[PDB]
Amino acid sequence: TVLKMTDLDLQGKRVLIREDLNVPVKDGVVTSDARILASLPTIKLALEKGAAVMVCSHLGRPTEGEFSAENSLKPVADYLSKALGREVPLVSDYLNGVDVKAGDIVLFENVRFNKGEKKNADELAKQYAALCDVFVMDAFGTAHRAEGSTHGVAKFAKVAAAGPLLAAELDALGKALGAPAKPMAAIVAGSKVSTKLDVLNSLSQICDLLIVGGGIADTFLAAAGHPVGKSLYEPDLLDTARAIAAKVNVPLPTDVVVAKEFAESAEATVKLIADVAADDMILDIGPQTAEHFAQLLKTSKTILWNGPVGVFEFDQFGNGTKVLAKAIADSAAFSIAGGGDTLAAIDKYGVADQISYISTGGGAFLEFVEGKVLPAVEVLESRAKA
């Protein structure tokens, strides 16, 4: 367990909150604010509880030690000022002290500018901790990496707790991965079985139904001796795919959508899996497979969604993902989705409000599903003991 910011007395205390404000910026303007909107309840709560609030976050991947204006959090300070109806200053020099009174809030400049951030140097971690009475970790999307603002500061802060956003992510994930409501289905897609091997292996013992898509589905199709044509699969992993399919039910596609090239004179063709030619590219599941997979998902009590089942950004290759998105949305299951590709499909087909939990954790989301120890959560558990 971890301490919760909601349960702490923050009246007059200096609270340092690590948020995930790594948002798209163009010419000094935030262009999509979903991550800031998600963090605003935490910030407003901290102020409501009477704290002197310091918000910190990363942005992009600048070179450590050198200031780069394109990686500055100044556009987020502009956004936060408009969002809170009050000035939110960007403090660019803070590791040797920062002046913040109770009721006020500042935004630290990009933590990735600070030397020692990526390698979690003790000296920088103690500088963060010296600036606050409480440290709050509220950035799940960075919880899988030990960095000065995500891990080290929690070793040295007088009090270290999880924010309500991080606590919400951990609640939803534990609901789907710790004794989930059966039957559980998972959808896993990607270009390579090898790159998602631990994800597949972990889910293979958790779920009752494993739907695969993309290049992963190619390797499983070829592992059953089916022709995939000009579609990437990994010959050194068909044995692994066979082992996975022996441990969990992996239904294979009945039909697929193929095309010989991306061109104006390129017809998308539905073919049965035995009828795929050497120069065919499998780019979606067929309408029969999409309907059958939808019927399998409809009675699930838990659904873990990690990937579309076709190159859905093309409408001619997006039917399989569209049908599955509606199937998940229509189902009464507890639905949890993660991965940038999955969230992109959720936006395109408009099912966000019908998904039980939408994780923005990306790589950290996957590593949690793999069963790996997330260091930012591990250090918080160390600070939650009597």
Short mmCIF file of all heavy atoms in Angstrom, two decimals, residues 332-384:
data_model
loop_
_atom_site.label_atom_id
_atom_site.label_comp_id
_atom_site.label_asym_id
_atom_site.label_seq_id
_atom_site.Cartn_x
_atom_site.Cartn_y
_atom_site.Cartn_z
N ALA A 332 -20.98 -5.05 -20.95
CA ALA A 332 -21.08 -4.66 -19.55
C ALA A 332 -19.80 -4.97 -18.78
O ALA A 332 -19.77 -4.77 -17.56
CB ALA A 332 -22.27 -5.36 -18.88
N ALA A 333 -18.76 -5.44 -19.45
CA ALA A 333 -17.51 -5.78 -18.79
C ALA A 333 -16.83 -4.54 -18.23
O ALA A 333 -17.10 -3.41 -18.65
CB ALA A 333 -16.56 -6.48 -19.76
N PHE A 334 -15.94 -4.76 -17.27
CA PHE A 334 -15.02 -3.71 -16.84
C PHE A 334 -13.94 -3.60 -17.90
O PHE A 334 -13.10 -4.50 -18.03
CB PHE A 334 -14.43 -4.05 -15.48
CG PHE A 334 -13.49 -3.00 -14.96
CD1 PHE A 334 -13.98 -1.80 -14.48
CD2 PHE A 334 -12.12 -3.20 -14.97
CE1 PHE A 334 -13.12 -0.81 -14.01
CE2 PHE A 334 -11.25 -2.22 -14.50
CZ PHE A 334 -11.76 -1.03 -14.02
N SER A 335 -13.95 -2.51 -18.67
CA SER A 335 -13.03 -2.35 -19.79
C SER A 335 -11.89 -1.42 -19.40
O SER A 335 -12.12 -0.32 -18.89
CB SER A 335 -13.77 -1.80 -21.01
OG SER A 335 -14.64 -0.74 -20.65
N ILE A 336 -10.66 -1.87 -19.63
CA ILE A 336 -9.48 -1.05 -19.40
C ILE A 336 -8.66 -1.05 -20.68
O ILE A 336 -8.39 -2.12 -21.25
CB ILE A 336 -8.65 -1.54 -18.20
CG1 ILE A 336 -7.33 -0.78 -18.13
CG2 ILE A 336 -8.46 -3.05 -18.27
CD1 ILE A 336 -6.83 -0.58 -16.72
N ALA A 337 -8.28 0.13 -21.14
CA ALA A 337 -7.53 0.31 -22.37
C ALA A 337 -6.24 1.06 -22.09
O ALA A 337 -6.17 1.91 -21.20
CB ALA A 337 -8.35 1.06 -23.43
N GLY A 338 -5.20 0.74 -22.87
CA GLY A 338 -3.92 1.39 -22.72
C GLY A 338 -3.11 1.27 -23.99
O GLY A 338 -3.30 0.34 -24.78
N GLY A 339 -2.21 2.22 -24.19
CA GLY A 339 -1.39 2.26 -25.39
C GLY A 339 -1.84 3.40 -26.29
O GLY A 339 -3.04 3.63 -26.47
N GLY A 340 -0.87 4.10 -26.86
CA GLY A 340 -1.19 5.24 -27.71
C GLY A 340 -2.03 4.86 -28.91
O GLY A 340 -2.94 5.60 -29.30
N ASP A 341 -1.74 3.71 -29.51
CA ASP A 341 -2.54 3.24 -30.64
C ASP A 341 -3.98 2.98 -30.23
O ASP A 341 -4.92 3.33 -30.95
CB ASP A 341 -1.92 1.97 -31.24
CG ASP A 341 -0.63 2.24 -31.97
OD1 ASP A 341 -0.30 3.43 -32.19
OD2 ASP A 341 0.06 1.27 -32.33
N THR A 342 -4.18 2.38 -29.05
CA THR A 342 -5.52 2.07 -28.59
C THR A 342 -6.31 3.34 -28.30
O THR A 342 -7.49 3.45 -28.67
CB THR A 342 -5.45 1.19 -27.34
OG1 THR A 342 -4.58 0.08 -27.58
CG2 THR A 342 -6.83 0.68 -26.96
N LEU A 343 -5.68 4.31 -27.64
CA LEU A 343 -6.37 5.56 -27.33
C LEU A 343 -6.71 6.33 -28.60
O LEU A 343 -7.73 7.02 -28.66
CB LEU A 343 -5.53 6.42 -26.39
CG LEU A 343 -5.11 5.88 -25.02
CD1 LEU A 343 -5.04 7.01 -24.01
CD2 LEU A 343 -6.03 4.77 -24.52
N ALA A 344 -5.86 6.21 -29.63
CA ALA A 344 -6.16 6.84 -30.92
C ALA A 344 -7.41 6.24 -31.54
O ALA A 344 -8.25 6.96 -32.10
CB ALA A 344 -4.97 6.70 -31.86
N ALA A 345 -7.56 4.91 -31.47
CA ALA A 345 -8.77 4.27 -31.98
C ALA A 345 -9.99 4.65 -31.15
O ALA A 345 -11.08 4.84 -31.69
CB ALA A 345 -8.59 2.75 -32.00
N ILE A 346 -9.82 4.77 -29.83
CA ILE A 346 -10.92 5.18 -28.96
C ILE A 346 -11.44 6.55 -29.37
O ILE A 346 -12.65 6.79 -29.42
CB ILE A 346 -10.48 5.15 -27.49
CG1 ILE A 346 -10.35 3.71 -27.00
CG2 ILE A 346 -11.44 5.93 -26.62
CD1 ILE A 346 -9.78 3.60 -25.60
N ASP A 347 -10.52 7.47 -29.69
CA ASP A 347 -10.93 8.80 -30.13
C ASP A 347 -11.64 8.75 -31.47
O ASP A 347 -12.69 9.38 -31.66
CB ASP A 347 -9.72 9.72 -30.20
CG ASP A 347 -9.05 9.92 -28.86
OD1 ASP A 347 -9.74 9.80 -27.83
OD2 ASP A 347 -7.83 10.21 -28.84
N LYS A 348 -11.09 7.99 -32.43
CA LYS A 348 -11.64 7.97 -33.78
C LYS A 348 -13.07 7.43 -33.80
O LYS A 348 -13.93 7.95 -34.52
CB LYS A 348 -10.74 7.15 -34.70
CG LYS A 348 -11.42 6.73 -36.00
CD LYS A 348 -10.41 6.45 -37.11
CE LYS A 348 -11.12 6.14 -38.42
NZ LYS A 348 -10.16 5.95 -39.55
N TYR A 349 -13.33 6.38 -33.02
CA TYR A 349 -14.64 5.73 -33.04
C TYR A 349 -15.54 6.16 -31.89
O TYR A 349 -16.65 5.63 -31.76
CB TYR A 349 -14.45 4.21 -33.05
CG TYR A 349 -13.63 3.75 -34.24
CD1 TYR A 349 -12.38 3.17 -34.07
CD2 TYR A 349 -14.10 3.92 -35.53
CE1 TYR A 349 -11.63 2.76 -35.15
CE2 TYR A 349 -13.36 3.51 -36.62
CZ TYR A 349 -12.12 2.93 -36.43
OH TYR A 349 -11.38 2.53 -37.51
N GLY A 350 -15.09 7.10 -31.06
CA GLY A 350 -15.95 7.77 -30.10
C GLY A 350 -16.55 6.90 -29.01
O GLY A 350 -17.75 7.01 -28.74
N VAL A 351 -15.75 6.06 -28.37
CA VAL A 351 -16.24 5.14 -27.35
C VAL A 351 -15.62 5.44 -25.99
O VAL A 351 -15.71 4.62 -25.08
CB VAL A 351 -16.01 3.68 -27.76
CG1 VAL A 351 -16.67 3.39 -29.10
CG2 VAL A 351 -14.52 3.37 -27.81
N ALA A 352 -15.02 6.62 -25.83
CA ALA A 352 -14.25 6.92 -24.61
C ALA A 352 -15.12 6.82 -23.36
O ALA A 352 -14.72 6.20 -22.37
CB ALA A 352 -13.62 8.31 -24.72
N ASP A 353 -16.32 7.41 -23.40
CA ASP A 353 -17.17 7.42 -22.22
C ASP A 353 -17.69 6.03 -21.86
O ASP A 353 -18.14 5.83 -20.72
CB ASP A 353 -18.34 8.38 -22.42
CG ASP A 353 -17.91 9.83 -22.48
OD1 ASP A 353 -16.70 10.09 -22.34
OD2 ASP A 353 -18.78 10.70 -22.67
N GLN A 354 -17.65 5.08 -22.78
CA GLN A 354 -18.12 3.73 -22.52
C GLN A 354 -17.01 2.77 -22.12
O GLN A 354 -17.29 1.59 -21.85
CB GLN A 354 -18.85 3.18 -23.76
CG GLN A 354 -19.88 4.12 -24.37
CD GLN A 354 -20.79 4.75 -23.34
OE1 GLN A 354 -21.73 4.12 -22.85
NE2 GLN A 354 -20.55 6.02 -23.02
N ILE A 355 -15.77 3.23 -22.07
CA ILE A 355 -14.65 2.42 -21.58
C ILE A 355 -14.50 2.68 -20.09
O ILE A 355 -14.47 3.84 -19.65
CB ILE A 355 -13.36 2.77 -22.34
CG1 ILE A 355 -13.54 2.54 -23.84
CG2 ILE A 355 -12.19 1.94 -21.82
CD1 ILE A 355 -14.01 1.15 -24.21
N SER A 356 -14.41 1.60 -19.30
CA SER A 356 -14.45 1.75 -17.85
C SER A 356 -13.26 2.56 -17.35
O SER A 356 -13.42 3.47 -16.53
CB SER A 356 -14.48 0.37 -17.19
OG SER A 356 -15.76 -0.23 -17.31
N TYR A 357 -12.06 2.27 -17.85
CA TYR A 357 -10.89 3.06 -17.49
C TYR A 357 -9.94 3.17 -18.67
O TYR A 357 -9.60 2.16 -19.29
CB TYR A 357 -10.16 2.47 -16.28
CG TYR A 357 -9.22 3.45 -15.63
CD1 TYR A 357 -9.65 4.29 -14.61
CD2 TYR A 357 -7.90 3.57 -16.05
CE1 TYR A 357 -8.80 5.20 -14.02
CE2 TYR A 357 -7.04 4.48 -15.46
CZ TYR A 357 -7.50 5.29 -14.45
OH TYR A 357 -6.66 6.20 -13.86
N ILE A 358 -9.51 4.39 -18.97
CA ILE A 358 -8.61 4.67 -20.08
C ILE A 358 -7.26 5.07 -19.48
O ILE A 358 -7.10 6.19 -18.98
CB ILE A 358 -9.16 5.76 -21.01
CG1 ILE A 358 -10.44 5.28 -21.69
CG2 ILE A 358 -8.12 6.16 -22.04
CD1 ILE A 358 -11.18 6.36 -22.43
N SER A 359 -6.29 4.16 -19.54
CA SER A 359 -4.97 4.42 -19.00
C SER A 359 -4.13 5.18 -20.02
O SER A 359 -4.01 4.76 -21.18
CB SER A 359 -4.28 3.12 -18.61
OG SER A 359 -2.91 3.36 -18.31
N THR A 360 -3.57 6.31 -19.60
CA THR A 360 -2.62 7.06 -20.41
C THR A 360 -1.17 6.72 -20.07
O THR A 360 -0.26 7.47 -20.43
CB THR A 360 -2.85 8.56 -20.24
OG1 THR A 360 -2.53 8.94 -18.90
CG2 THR A 360 -4.31 8.90 -20.51
N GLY A 361 -0.94 5.59 -19.38
CA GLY A 361 0.38 5.28 -18.86
C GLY A 361 1.37 4.74 -19.87
O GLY A 361 2.57 4.71 -19.59
N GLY A 362 0.89 4.31 -21.04
CA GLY A 362 1.76 3.85 -22.11
C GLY A 362 2.72 2.74 -21.71
O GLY A 362 2.30 1.62 -21.41
N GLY A 363 4.01 3.06 -21.70
CA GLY A 363 5.01 2.05 -21.36
C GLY A 363 4.87 1.54 -19.94
O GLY A 363 5.07 0.35 -19.68
N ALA A 364 4.55 2.44 -19.01
CA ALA A 364 4.32 2.01 -17.63
C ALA A 364 3.09 1.11 -17.53
O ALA A 364 3.07 0.17 -16.73
CB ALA A 364 4.16 3.23 -16.72
N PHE A 365 2.07 1.39 -18.34
CA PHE A 365 0.89 0.52 -18.40
C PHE A 365 1.29 -0.90 -18.78
O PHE A 365 0.86 -1.87 -18.15
CB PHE A 365 -0.12 1.10 -19.39
CG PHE A 365 -1.28 0.20 -19.69
CD1 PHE A 365 -2.37 0.13 -18.83
CD2 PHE A 365 -1.29 -0.58 -20.84
CE1 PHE A 365 -3.44 -0.70 -19.11
CE2 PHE A 365 -2.36 -1.40 -21.13
CZ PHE A 365 -3.43 -1.46 -20.26
N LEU A 366 2.12 -1.03 -19.82
CA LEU A 366 2.55 -2.36 -20.27
C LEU A 366 3.36 -3.07 -19.19
O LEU A 366 3.13 -4.25 -18.91
CB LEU A 366 3.36 -2.23 -21.56
CG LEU A 366 2.61 -1.74 -22.80
CD1 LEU A 366 3.55 -1.63 -23.98
CD2 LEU A 366 1.45 -2.66 -23.12
N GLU A 367 4.31 -2.37 -18.58
CA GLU A 367 5.17 -3.00 -17.58
C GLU A 367 4.37 -3.43 -16.36
O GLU A 367 4.72 -4.43 -15.71
CB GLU A 367 6.30 -2.06 -17.19
CG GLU A 367 7.22 -1.70 -18.35
CD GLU A 367 8.60 -1.26 -17.90
OE1 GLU A 367 8.94 -1.46 -16.71
OE2 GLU A 367 9.36 -0.72 -18.73
N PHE A 368 3.30 -2.71 -16.02
CA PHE A 368 2.41 -3.17 -14.96
C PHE A 368 1.70 -4.45 -15.37
O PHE A 368 1.60 -5.39 -14.57
CB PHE A 368 1.40 -2.08 -14.59
CG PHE A 368 0.69 -2.33 -13.28
CD1 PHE A 368 1.02 -1.60 -12.15
CD2 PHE A 368 -0.30 -3.29 -13.18
CE1 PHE A 368 0.37 -1.82 -10.95
CE2 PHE A 368 -0.95 -3.52 -11.98
CZ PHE A 368 -0.62 -2.79 -10.87
N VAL A 369 1.21 -4.51 -16.61
CA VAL A 369 0.55 -5.72 -17.09
C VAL A 369 1.52 -6.89 -17.11
O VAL A 369 1.13 -8.04 -16.84
CB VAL A 369 -0.07 -5.47 -18.48
CG1 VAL A 369 -0.72 -6.74 -19.02
CG2 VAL A 369 -1.08 -4.34 -18.42
N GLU A 370 2.79 -6.63 -17.40
CA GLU A 370 3.81 -7.67 -17.38
C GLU A 370 4.08 -8.21 -15.98
O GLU A 370 4.74 -9.25 -15.85
CB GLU A 370 5.12 -7.15 -17.98
CG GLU A 370 5.04 -6.84 -19.46
CD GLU A 370 6.20 -5.99 -19.95
OE1 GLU A 370 7.02 -5.57 -19.10
OE2 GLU A 370 6.30 -5.76 -21.17
N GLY A 371 3.60 -7.54 -14.94
CA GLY A 371 3.90 -7.93 -13.58
C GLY A 371 5.21 -7.41 -13.05
O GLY A 371 5.66 -7.86 -11.99
N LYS A 372 5.84 -6.46 -13.74
CA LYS A 372 7.10 -5.90 -13.28
C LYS A 372 6.87 -4.93 -12.14
O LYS A 372 5.81 -4.31 -12.01
CB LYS A 372 7.82 -5.19 -14.43
CG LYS A 372 8.79 -6.08 -15.19
CD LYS A 372 9.03 -5.56 -16.60
CE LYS A 372 9.66 -6.63 -17.47
NZ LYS A 372 8.82 -7.86 -17.54
N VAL A 373 7.90 -4.79 -11.30
CA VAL A 373 7.87 -3.83 -10.20
C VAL A 373 8.10 -2.44 -10.77
O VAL A 373 9.12 -2.19 -11.42
CB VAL A 373 8.91 -4.18 -9.13
CG1 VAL A 373 8.94 -3.12 -8.04
CG2 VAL A 373 8.63 -5.56 -8.54
N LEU A 374 7.16 -1.54 -10.53
CA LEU A 374 7.30 -0.15 -10.96
C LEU A 374 8.04 0.63 -9.88
O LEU A 374 7.52 0.75 -8.76
CB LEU A 374 5.95 0.47 -11.24
CG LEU A 374 5.45 0.30 -12.68
CD1 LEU A 374 5.23 -1.17 -13.05
CD2 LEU A 374 4.19 1.11 -12.95
N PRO A 375 9.22 1.18 -10.16
CA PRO A 375 10.04 1.76 -9.08
C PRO A 375 9.38 2.90 -8.33
O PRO A 375 9.54 3.00 -7.11
CB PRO A 375 11.32 2.22 -9.80
CG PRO A 375 11.03 2.12 -11.27
CD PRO A 375 9.97 1.08 -11.43
N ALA A 376 8.64 3.77 -9.02
CA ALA A 376 7.98 4.87 -8.32
C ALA A 376 6.95 4.36 -7.32
O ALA A 376 6.74 4.98 -6.27
CB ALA A 376 7.32 5.82 -9.32
N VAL A 377 6.30 3.23 -7.63
CA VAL A 377 5.37 2.63 -6.68
C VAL A 377 6.12 1.92 -5.57
O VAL A 377 5.68 1.91 -4.41
CB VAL A 377 4.41 1.69 -7.41
CG1 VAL A 377 3.41 1.07 -6.44
CG2 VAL A 377 3.68 2.43 -8.52
N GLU A 378 7.27 1.31 -5.89
CA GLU A 378 8.04 0.59 -4.88
C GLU A 378 8.55 1.52 -3.79
O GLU A 378 8.48 1.19 -2.60
CB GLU A 378 9.20 -0.15 -5.54
CG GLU A 378 10.10 -0.90 -4.57
CD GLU A 378 11.21 -1.65 -5.28
OE1 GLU A 378 12.10 -0.98 -5.87
OE2 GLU A 378 11.19 -2.90 -5.27
N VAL A 379 9.05 2.70 -4.17
CA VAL A 379 9.59 3.62 -3.18
C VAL A 379 8.47 4.21 -2.32
O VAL A 379 8.67 4.50 -1.14
CB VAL A 379 10.43 4.71 -3.86
CG1 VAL A 379 9.57 5.58 -4.77
CG2 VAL A 379 11.16 5.56 -2.83
N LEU A 380 7.28 4.40 -2.90
CA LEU A 380 6.15 4.88 -2.10
C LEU A 380 5.73 3.85 -1.06
O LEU A 380 5.43 4.20 0.09
CB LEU A 380 4.98 5.24 -3.02
CG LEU A 380 5.15 6.49 -3.88
CD1 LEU A 380 3.94 6.68 -4.79
CD2 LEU A 380 5.38 7.72 -3.02
N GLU A 381 5.70 2.57 -1.44
CA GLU A 381 5.40 1.51 -0.48
C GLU A 381 6.42 1.49 0.65
O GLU A 381 6.07 1.18 1.79
CB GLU A 381 5.36 0.16 -1.19
CG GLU A 381 4.23 0.02 -2.19
CD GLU A 381 4.30 -1.28 -2.97
OE1 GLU A 381 5.40 -1.85 -3.09
OE2 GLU A 381 3.24 -1.74 -3.47
N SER A 382 7.68 1.81 0.35
CA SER A 382 8.70 1.86 1.39
C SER A 382 8.44 2.98 2.39
O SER A 382 8.82 2.86 3.56
CB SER A 382 10.08 2.03 0.75
OG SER A 382 10.43 3.40 0.64
N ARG A 383 7.80 4.06 1.96
CA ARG A 383 7.50 5.19 2.82
C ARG A 383 6.13 5.10 3.48
O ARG A 383 5.75 6.03 4.20
CB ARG A 383 7.60 6.50 2.03
CG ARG A 383 8.92 6.70 1.30
CD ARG A 383 10.11 6.64 2.26
NE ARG A 383 9.91 7.46 3.45
CZ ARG A 383 10.04 8.78 3.49
NH1 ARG A 383 10.38 9.45 2.40
NH2 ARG A 383 9.83 9.43 4.62
N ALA A 384 5.40 4.01 3.27
CA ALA A 384 4.06 3.85 3.82
C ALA A 384 4.03 2.93 5.03
O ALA A 384 2.94 2.56 5.48
CB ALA A 384 3.10 3.34 2.74
#
